[PDB]
Amino acid sequence: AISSSISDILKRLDAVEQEAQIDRLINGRLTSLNAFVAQQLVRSETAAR
Amino acid sequence: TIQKVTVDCKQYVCNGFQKCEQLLREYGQFCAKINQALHGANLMQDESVANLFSDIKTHKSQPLNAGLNGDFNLTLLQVPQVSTSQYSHRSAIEDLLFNKVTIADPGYMQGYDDCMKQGPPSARDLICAQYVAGYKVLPPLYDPNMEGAYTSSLLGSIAGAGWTAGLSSFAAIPFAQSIFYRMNGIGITQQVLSENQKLIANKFNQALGAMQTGFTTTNLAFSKVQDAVNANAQALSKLASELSNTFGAISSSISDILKRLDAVEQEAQIDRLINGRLTSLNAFVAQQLVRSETAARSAQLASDKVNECVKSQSKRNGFCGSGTHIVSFVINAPNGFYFFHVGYVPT
Amino acid sequence: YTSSLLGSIAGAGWTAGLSSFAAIPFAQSIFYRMNGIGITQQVLSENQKLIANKFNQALGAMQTGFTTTNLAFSKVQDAVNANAQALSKLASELSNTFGAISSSISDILKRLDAVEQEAQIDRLINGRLTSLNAFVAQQLVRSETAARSAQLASDKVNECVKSQSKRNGFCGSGTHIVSFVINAPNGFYFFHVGYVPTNHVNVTAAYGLCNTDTPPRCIAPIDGYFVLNNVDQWYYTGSSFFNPEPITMANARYVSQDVKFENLTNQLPPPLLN
Amino acid sequence: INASKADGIIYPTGKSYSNISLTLQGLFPKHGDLGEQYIYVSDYATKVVPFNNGFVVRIGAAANATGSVIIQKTIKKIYP
Amino acid sequence: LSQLYCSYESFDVGSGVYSVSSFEVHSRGQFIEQPNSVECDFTKLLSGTPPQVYNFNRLVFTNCNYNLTKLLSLFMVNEFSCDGISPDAIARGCYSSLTVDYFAYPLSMKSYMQPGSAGVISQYNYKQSFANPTCRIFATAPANLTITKPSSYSFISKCSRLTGDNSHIETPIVINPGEYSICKNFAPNGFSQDGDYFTRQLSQLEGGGILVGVGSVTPMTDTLQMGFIISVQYGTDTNSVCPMMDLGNSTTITDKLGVCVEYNLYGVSGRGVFINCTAVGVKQQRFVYDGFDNLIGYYSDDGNYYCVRPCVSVPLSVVYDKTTNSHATIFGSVACEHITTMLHQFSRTTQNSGPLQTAVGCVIGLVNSSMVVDNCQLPLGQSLCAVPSTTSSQLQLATINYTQPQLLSPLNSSGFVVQVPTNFSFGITQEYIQT
Ligand SMILES: *[C@@H]1O[C@H](CO)[C@@H](O[C@@H]2O[C@H](CO)[C@@H](O)[C@H](O)[C@H]2NC(C)=O)[C@H](O)[C@H]1NC(C)=O
Ligand SMILES: *[C@@H]1O[C@H](CO)[C@@H](O[C@@H]2O[C@H](CO)[C@@H](O)[C@H](O)[C@H]2NC(C)=O)[C@H](O)[C@H]1NC(C)=O
């Protein structure tokens, strides 16, 4: 996206372009959160053993 | 074990539509790789199960009475009489354990027809959803009868006397005498055993009579059984629910995209769904591999536990329960083994 | 490192193990490991050459297990294939277009203009970073698993190769005698030698024997059974091989009175005479 | 307003659901809101209220009861 | 076997039991229920003088059919810009509602009504909303029609509130997308002169409202030009706005229960299986959805409620034996009757190794022999296996056998009986541990 700040995207763009650029950040953050959860689960199983 | 699941990758990603299918090929041998990884995981699971049941196999046994051996009541640990709740090899306590756990029936024989005939019942069913989404639950290597036979042959194992090696001879020593020897070796003299024979047997029967009461989520092990069941269900839920993620497209339905848009816009919107579904399938495969590795290591641990606590008496503390170990029993549980460690608890 | 283990010297049997170093030859160590599983010295002396021949017969056929029909060899090849699979997944992912016109940055710079070029290169960049993250995560998991397995391999060397194991199933099936470890691709390969009995015989055994005296003295067998044979004479046999021998204090220990013990008045064994 | 009774909820248009729960956004009243009460009189036509998102009316809560006008009988609903 | 060589993609595949990709599903069925809908009313648009841009006329169409081609061929399109839909999909689709904003607009200004524009049209006259699938059209009306021309083109150039004690503070008032300007009431039918700074600027109840009408007497072109803002909605109603069509007779579902059929029921389009069930949900709403907005029910005109099961694919597996080049097919969790009726299977299954019912589902290519095995290499689940035939290369359906343990009888005498070995051998267990 043009930036990683939603405030900048809301500054510089219009409705459709804003929506696409916010969707980029949304999807990226969801994928990274999924990765974080998976690695936490692995680490916690290891720590229990 | 874990539930064995395979995915029809092409049907899962493209849901039948042809434009998606031709667009799917710009990503390498993705569906083939998904299929091969799942196949390898299931193959390793089957080999693990075969090795486990070959390791816990008994080669010599002795007859046991039906209700009382000496003064010990082993009714709950034995396959019942003509009652025979459609397994004929599952014991009474195993029946109770399997009746206290809620498991969705996968319908390994006619589940497709059941899912088409039923209709309404079990809204958001995961077993029925496997035919819409395009994943398949595979049946276990052995049916419950043969696993029940394996774990029921263990109650009458012989293994040789307690003061000897343990896999060279076979001493046909009755159950009561074996228990009394196991108590003699923890520091209880023969005079005490002779004096307190019936008291000891009554306390043992008191202990066995109350192991039904531990089939609650307040108990740790039963809650772990249900946790494993829930993890099995959770994998299928996360697989089936990801098909409604739009990944930033107008819809998550390829029919709607083909309905509302033109060629280039259609192609871009379909690429969105394709990429998202491939990433989610890769994640599913990775977690299934991790879970299967863990389950194989835990199967090795279960074999070790059988050989140390069930077939023999343990001198380690805390390995076969809390206290001074006497004798352990193992039954079949959903996705693994369930143990009953009998220990000497002084007061 | 692994070849130095064959001639390794530790404390003798019947001792602690890491305090002293006993220069006991290999054959004597084998016969002690056999004596401690329930085979008396008389049987070992009689069956010396037979035992050596059977050991040389078992040790001469371990090469025939180097096939994928064998579990352990198949697991070696599985580890090799996993190593190759990581590299193949890493290298094949560079042809993923990730929804761009091509997988080649040269083609994208060839066919498009500035903004479209930047969008397509962004596609390729994002895809490659996600795949690299996945590769790193799976390498971390595999390496942690391999470190735990290396700890297990060290445990197995210490229990099965440098010593005889009394646990059942830790060093293979049967009664453990001796184990050897060699190097394998990405790990260790063990050869566990176990005692596998055949042709058992039914005999009548006694829990113990007792004389008829003021408070009676009673005996129980040591690592064996009090067996009859094949006004009745009792003999001692090892638990791992049938050979009736006279009952002495070398194979009997004094125990307390029991009601399932035999009551002997004739041909009393030497431990039960006053 | 009691959300546990689904007080003043506008049903989804063009579709229906059976035997399931789900979250859903839209225009709803606030739980525990008391609102303004009007009795059918005086002074109502002089007061101008903003409409911002609309409003929901509860009609005939006191019907089949005993009461009287505020400016003795059985109460009835009077359709604002 | 080709589905295997192509689902794992090589000539050389080892022995095993593999899942493979199924075959396509047929869409031949059509269950269509359409009301006898009235025609949509394109008469206020097709007659009279179109308004200006700030006084646009809004048309909402529901529960009717449109002859769009008859309307498309009247006008002369110059520019369109669609977002979330296309004109062809608009011309071929069914919707809950159709919303039209139409007005008179000059072609020279069609960039001032573009997303992100900075002029006075998006500030004070008309801002397009993008909450729904929408599309812009600029078109020219031919003179011979019933549509007449305004005196000129006009717009709002300044809408502002003067606040403060001396009214010395000038603050603009701007419109939200899809709404009208407060300054519309100064000159509803258009400004009469360029620069019509109104003389009194009606004093409102929170300050003084100011309008300027530099929206000129901008000369009317030789041909009238108009702007159209189209928007469509899905799933918001029980009825639909559908194109004029003649679809023959497919109105019955009485004797097509259980087959995968396509459907067009009051606009909603899809495919699935219809099964007569007990009426749930609200009959007035005519559709029952799930939490993900998927149709799983339908109240028919005949009076019956049908569950809408998506038509599914039968799972299929291939047992492969590489040494003897023999193979068999498992239809997992499917009874052989449903297989004998159904299709969506490959060419060689136009078809004594026929449909055999197992505990894992119907199989083709296995001969039932009631044999047993102990170690087998092609397990099928539920203690079933597939054994390569040594002689007929057909795979056989065997079972894994549980060998019983030998019993040693305890004695009735004083002691006990023990089995002591008389020979022995030296076994060797091999173990690999990765480090
Ligand atoms: C809001 O509605 C709920 C449901 O009618 C009320 O809760 C019930 O109250 C009755 C009487 O006290 C109980 O018998 C029920 O068991 C309650 N149901 C539940 C599920 O809580 C609640 O009283 C109302 N709340 C207010 C603030 O009046
Ligand atoms: C939709 O509109 C078109 C155009 O008005 C109609 O097409 C006409 O159909 C009649 C049938 O009697 C022909 O005689 C005309 O020549 C056609 N005109 C053109 C330009 O093709 C069509 O009939 C309308 N459809 C409906 C059912 O309303």
Ligand SMILES: *[C@@H]1O[C@H](CO)[C@@H](O)[C@H](O)[C@H]1NC(C)=O
């Ligand atoms: C043995 O236990 C069962 C239930 O576990 C009981 O029904 C039976 O009466 C018991 N037997 C005796 C002899 O008490």
Ligand SMILES: *[C@@H]1O[C@H](CO)[C@@H](O)[C@H](O)[C@H]1NC(C)=O
């Ligand atoms: C046991 O019996 C056999 C067979 O007669 C005999 O050869 C052997 O000497 C006996 N064992 C003794 C006497 O210890």
Ligand SMILES: *[C@@H]1O[C@H](CO)[C@@H](O)[C@H](O)[C@H]1NC(C)=O
């Ligand atoms: C041995 O003698 C005692 C009596 O002192 C008796 O209790 C016991 O049963 C006898 N044992 C056997 C097995 O003969």
Ligand SMILES: *[C@@H]1O[C@H](CO)[C@@H](O)[C@H](O)[C@H]1NC(C)=O
């Ligand atoms: C409604 O759903 C519940 C589970 O949430 C289920 O137990 C119940 O049987 C369902 N009722 C009907 C009529 O299907």
Ligand SMILES: *[C@@H]1O[C@H](CO)[C@@H](O)[C@H](O)[C@H]1NC(C)=O
């Ligand atoms: C009605 O609206 C017009 C403009 O649309 C406005 O000029 C007029 O003042 C309004 N009516 C009254 C009574 O104010």
Ligand SMILES: *[C@@H]1O[C@H](CO)[C@@H](O)[C@H](O)[C@H]1NC(C)=O
């Ligand atoms: C296979 O053949 C045996 C022969 O008696 C028959 O009993 C059985 O029903 C057949 N089918 C299966 C699935 O075993």
Ligand SMILES: *[C@@H]1O[C@H](CO)[C@@H](O)[C@H](O)[C@H]1NC(C)=O
């Ligand atoms: C030795 O063992 C073999 C088989 O392992 C058997 O055939 C033979 O009879 C045994 N010899 C004796 C003396 O028992």
